[PDB]
Amino acid sequence: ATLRIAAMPALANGLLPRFLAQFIRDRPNLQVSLMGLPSSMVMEAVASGRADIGYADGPQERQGFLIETRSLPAVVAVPMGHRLAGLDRVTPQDLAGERIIKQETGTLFAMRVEVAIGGIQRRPSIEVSLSHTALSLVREGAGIAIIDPAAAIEFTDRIVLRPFSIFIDAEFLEVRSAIGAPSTIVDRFTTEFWRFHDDLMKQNGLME
Amino acid sequence: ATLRIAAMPALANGLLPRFLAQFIRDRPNLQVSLMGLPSSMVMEAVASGRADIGYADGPQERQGFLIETRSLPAVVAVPMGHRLAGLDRVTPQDLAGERIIKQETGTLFAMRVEVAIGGIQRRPSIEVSLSHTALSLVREGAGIAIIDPAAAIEFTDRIVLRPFSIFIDAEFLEVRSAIGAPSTIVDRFTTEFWRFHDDLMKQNGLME
Ligand SMILES: C[C@@H](N[C@@H](CCCNC(=N)N)C(=O)O)C(=O)O
Ligand SMILES: C[C@@H](N[C@@H](CCCNC(=N)N)C(=O)O)C(=O)O
């Protein structure tokens, strides 16, 4: 038995290996691989057959793929003790004067954020590409970030997460080859991962 | 003022943003970017000028680059409470029967590990490409990992690190363009990052 998974770091760093450790605990003869790649390379892995399952940021070219989706609101991550931690939610103008940690310029997620805060004076920001970099900077008191909740979950013991007043789609995809035969093991992983993902998001106030 | 950095996730996830948050705390007008990329893409970023500084796994093609180095022994990461946590050091045969979390097949680091344990019976392993995935799996009790200490440092509160009896080179590179004019800001970052990296490694028993 062999299972090969490819995912972006947002999930490959924290959520997916937490799940994988549950999945395999009683499958001692299941050979597994879990590759952290950029989403673009996640797709190329699934298409070339180098990976059975892919997890990638949305959106992607869906041609040769079977694609399941999750959309969740992005959350605001702020350092412990920040003025904003004492709020029910965070609006664009609450961010005025703050150093904002931004995702990478030109990505769909980054532009959604940038559009939601088009009404505030732009200060010098920090640009990153990994959600985990942003969350580490938040933890260090360097600024605040609007991020996908999947990554944020690994930091809830050391930063504060608050809902944003504006819905910013933080979508990722579970990706399969459109070409292929049924796979019991793949159907099981994907299915249980959703249950596991949905449980965590709902139990932390990040999903309906 | 603008600073652009590209690094592999092993450093871009944890160490580099910890440092960046110190570097910028009193530079409110310094525009910074910190991109997590695969090492191969880290080099392409530095060569094309899309990044001023690169941090990448060793080794790389050194042609158009100025390259500074750190080599440190890889450490063994084991779950809290593991039998091996009670040892001064871990040898190859101490790993017999353990589920080993391996780096990606065919990489120089992965083959160094695999060579150091050629004398043990091979059991089904878990293959990953990010050190943070491996360390998360260790934390979950899924197995043990031989990893670069740079990444391991972000987990010392939740796993146990022990020296390996065999020296496995865990090298990374600070990378600059061979083409260019002096840069005060780049010289400062790199210099202080080394001081910061060296401090942490020495203060955690991971460097001489
Ligand atoms: C860089 C990488 N994605 C980020 C997350 C990007 C923001 N999240 C999102 N769009 N859902 C990561 O894995 O940390 C990618 O290009 O795949
Ligand atoms: C996948 C990525 N490097 C790993 C670390 C690989 C093992 N460490 C090492 N060889 N020093 C990471 O960033 O987690 C790279 O290809 O750049």
Curated annotation (Swiss-Prot), chains A, B:
Superkingdom: Bacteria
Presence of keyword Transcription: yes
GO biological process, one term: positive regulation of gene expression
Keyword Transcription regulation in record: yes
A GO molecular-function annotation: sequence-specific DNA binding
UniProtKB keywords: Activator, DNA-binding, Plasmid, Transcription, Transcription regulation
Cited function: Positive regulatory protein for the occ operon involved in octopine catabolism and uptake. Also acts as a negative regulator of its expression.
Family label: Belongs to the LysR transcriptional regulatory family.
Name under which the protein is recorded: Octopine catabolism/uptake operon regulatory protein OccR
Organism listed in the record: Agrobacterium tumefaciens (strain Ach5)
Lineage of source species: Bacteria, Pseudomonadati, Pseudomonadota, Alphaproteobacteria, Hyphomicrobiales
Gene expressing this chain: occR
